[PDB]
C-alpha cells in the first residue's frame, strides 16, 4: 500500500487540510514549498520539507524521489493572469516520476474541463487554459493518473459524505476544501479511479 507521498501545493487552501489529513492518516509526507514560513508551526506537520519551486526540475526531482504516489494541488492563489506554472510544474513532476519509478499521481484541475466551453466564465479562462494544458501533460504521460475536477471549492466542514461522479458533471456545484482533500487521499487507497475524470461534490 501507499505510505510515502509527495504533496505539491501543500501550503494552499486545499493543500493545508490535505497535508493535515494525510499526517493524521499515518502517511509519511514530503512537501515542496516556496517558503517553509507558509507551513504550520504546530499541529500535523510533514515528515520532510523541500524548499524550492515547482518550476525547478531539480527541486521537483528531490521531492518525488522515494515516494509511492504524488498529489498535485498547485494553483495560482488569487491571481487570474495568464500562466503556465501549473502545466510546466506538471511536466517537471511527470519527468521526475518517470526517472524515479513513481507511477501514481492524483492531480486537481477543475470541473470547467467538463463544461461546455462556451459556458466557462471569461474571467476564469486564463487559469482554465493552463488547467487544460496540465491535464494534457498528465493524460499523455502514461502514468496512473486520477484527474480530480472539482466545482467551486468552499470552506464548509469535512463530511466524507460527498458524491463522486465519474467522467461527467455531478449534482452539486460546491465541494468543501476538506472533502476535496479527503477525496485526494482516498484516491491513494484504490486504483478504481485511475484513468477517469472525478467530480467530487456535496450539498452542505
Ligand X SMILES: NC(=O)c1ccc[n+]([C@@H]2O[C@H](COP(=O)([O-])OP(=O)(O)OC[C@H]3O[C@@H](n4cnc5c(N)ncnc54)[C@H](OP(=O)(O)O)[C@@H]3O)[C@@H](O)[C@H]2O)c1
Ligand Y SMILES: CCc1c(-c2ccccc2)nn2c(=O)cc(-c3cccc(C(=O)O)c3)[nH]c12
Regarding 166 and contact with ligand Y (CB under 6 A), the answer is no
* 56 annotated binding-site participant: no
Cβ closest to ligand X, residue 2 vs residue 57: 57
* 97 annotated binding-site participant: no
| x/- map, 146-165, ligand Y, by CB under 6 A | -----xx-------------
Catalytic positions are 108, 187
Give ∠ CA 85-88-92 in degrees, rounded to 5: 125
85 binds, among ligand X, ligand Y, none (CB under 5 to 8 A by kind): ligand X
Are 10 and 30 spatial neighbours (Cβ–Cβ below 8 Å)?
Answer: no
**What is the closest distance, in whole angstroms, from the C-beta atom of residue 149 to ligand X in the complex?**
8
**What is the closest distance, in whole angstroms, from the C-beta atom of residue 193 to ligand Y in the complex?**
18
By the 10 Å C-beta count (0-12 exposed, 13-18 middle, 19+ buried), 189 is classed as exposed
Count of residues binding ligand X (CB under 6 A)? 26
Regarding 127 and contact with ligand Y (CB under 6 A), the answer is yes
Regarding 111 and contact with ligand Y (CB under 6 A), the answer is yes
Interacting span for ligand Y (CB under 6 A) from 11-19, 51-59, 110-118, 157-165 = 110-118
80 binds, among ligand Y, ligand X, none (CB under 5 to 8 A by kind): ligand Y
* 169 annotated binding-site participant: no
Question: How far is it, in rounded angstroms, from Cα 71 to Cα 19?
Answer: 10
C-alpha cell of residue 130: 493552463
Regarding 17 and contact with ligand X (CB under 6 A), the answer is no
User: Residues in the site for ligand X, rule: CB under 6 A?
Assistant: 9, 11-15, 32-35, 38, 53-55, 73-77, 85, 108, 110, 127, 150, 152-153
Amino acid at each position: 500500500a501507499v505510505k510515502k507521498i509527495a504533496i505539491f501545493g501543500a501550503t494552499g487552501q486545499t493543500g493545508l487540510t490535505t497535508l493535515a489529513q494525510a499526517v493524521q492518516a499515518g502517511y509519511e509526507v514530503t512537501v515542496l514549498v516556496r517558503d517553509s514560513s507558509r507551513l504550520p508551526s504546530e499541529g500535523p506537520r510533514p515528515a520532510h520539507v523541500v524548499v524550492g519551486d515547482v518550476l525547478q526540475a531539480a527541486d521537483v526531482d528531490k521531492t518525488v524521489a522515494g515516494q509511492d504516489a504524488v498529489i498535485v494541488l498547485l494553483g495560482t492563489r488569487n491571481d487570474l493572469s495568464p500562466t503556465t506554472v501549473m502545466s510546466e510544474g506538471a511536466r517537471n513532476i511527470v519527468a521526475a516520476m518517470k526517472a524515479h519509478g513513481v507511477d501514481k499521481v492524483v492531480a486537481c484541475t477543475s470541473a470547467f474541463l467538463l463544461w461546455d466551453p462556451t459556458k466557462v466564465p471569461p474571467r476564469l479562462q486564463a487559469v482554465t487554459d493552463d488547467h487544460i494544458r496540465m491535464h494534457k501533460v498528465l493524460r499523455e504521460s502514461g502514468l496512473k493518473y486520477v484527474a480530480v475536477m472539482p466545482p467551486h471549492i468552499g470552506d464548509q466542514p469535512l463530511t466524507g459524505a460527498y458524491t463522486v461522479t465519474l467522467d461527467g458533471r455531478g449534482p452539486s456545484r460546491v465541494i468543501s476544501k476538506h472533502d476535496l482533500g479527503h477525496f485526494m487521499l482516498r484516491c491513494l487507497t484504490t486504483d478504481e479511479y485511475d484513468g477517469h475524470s472525478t467530480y467530487p461534490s456535496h450539498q452542505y
